[PDB]
Amino acid sequence: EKLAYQQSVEMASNYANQFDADMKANLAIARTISTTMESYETADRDEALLILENLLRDNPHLLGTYVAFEPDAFDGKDAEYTNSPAHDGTGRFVPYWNKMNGTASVAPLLHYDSSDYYQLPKATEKDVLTEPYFYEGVFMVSYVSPIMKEGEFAGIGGVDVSLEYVDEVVSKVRTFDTGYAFMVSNSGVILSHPTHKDWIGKKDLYDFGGEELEKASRDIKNGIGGHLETADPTTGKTVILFYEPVETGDFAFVLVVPKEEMLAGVADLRE
């Protein structure tokens, strides 16, 4: 027993759930930014900006806040704002308020005609917690929510988090003697890691090499929690991965437990 397994699951789950609180709340902020923009008649760009700016300022964990509208969708005055502060050649209302370099500036969004953070919500007309991407230097993840104006898609409202935040938080976690933990996106990209920050956002469970690892990639794409045995990459010692879904977005929290250390666990139960 084997109630060893039972107990790692239970913890894996606990964590996954703590990180759900965090991610549920972020999305709530986006859903609220957008339900609001749906209800916004005035359509004063500065007032918007204020809202954005102030939600960033008041939510320190947030990489940035933003709104982005379809051509003229915001206030019909797109050709007016062309090239003014916080816009681009288009004059579309696409203001991104962000801490991207300690400094809390605002700037226009980039590639909103091609990036998930916009296109997925436009295609699905539903909320999204995007896969991690490398946007203009930083690896972040966006919680975006479509602004539906009377059954018609007017654009998005969102907020960002950096992986660098995530990893800071996750690599804290320890278990047993050598055991740790990492998050992973819904397609199994690596979101955090205690000793190889070079993997973050660059490798997904398919690169970790093995074929059982491809199995668990499917469980996590479906938000199913399970476990495997596998050799650590940097050393051949068998470890057990316990992944458990993070409900919003269906990411996965993976707990790494050294196969040994569990035999050591069970031993310490003989008297």
Kind of pairing between the strands at 95-101 and 103-108: antiparallel
Question: Residue with structure tokens 């998050």?
Answer: 183
Shortest approach of K ion to residue 113 CB, angstroms?
Answer: 5
Q: Which is nearer to K ion, 54 or 83 (CB)?
A: 83
In which element (H, E) is residue 161 found? Answer: strand 152-162
Q: Which is nearer to K ion, 13 or 119 (CB)?
A: 119
Shortest approach of K ion to residue 140 CB, angstroms?
Answer: 17
Tokens of 244: 């458990």
Shortest approach of K ion to residue 88 CB, angstroms?
Answer: 10
Q: Which is nearer to K ion, 111 or 126 (CB)?
A: 111
Site for K ion in 94-153 (CB under 5 A): 111, 114
Shortest approach of K ion to residue 110 CB, angstroms?
Answer: 7
Q: Which is nearer to K ion, 46 or 113 (CB)?
A: 113
Contact 256, 270 (CB under 8 A): no
The count of residues interacting with K ion (CB under 5 A) is 2
Task: Report the residue number whose CB is nearest to K ion.
Answer: 111
CB atoms within 10 A of CB 101: 9
Question: Residue with structure tokens 């370099």?
Answer: 101
Q: Which is nearer to K ion, 118 or 251 (CB)?
A: 118
Q: Return contacts of 109-115, CB within 8 angstroms, 24+ apart.
A: 109/66, 109/68, 110/135, 110/136, 112/68
Given the rule CB under 5 A, which residues bind K ion?
Answer: 111, 114
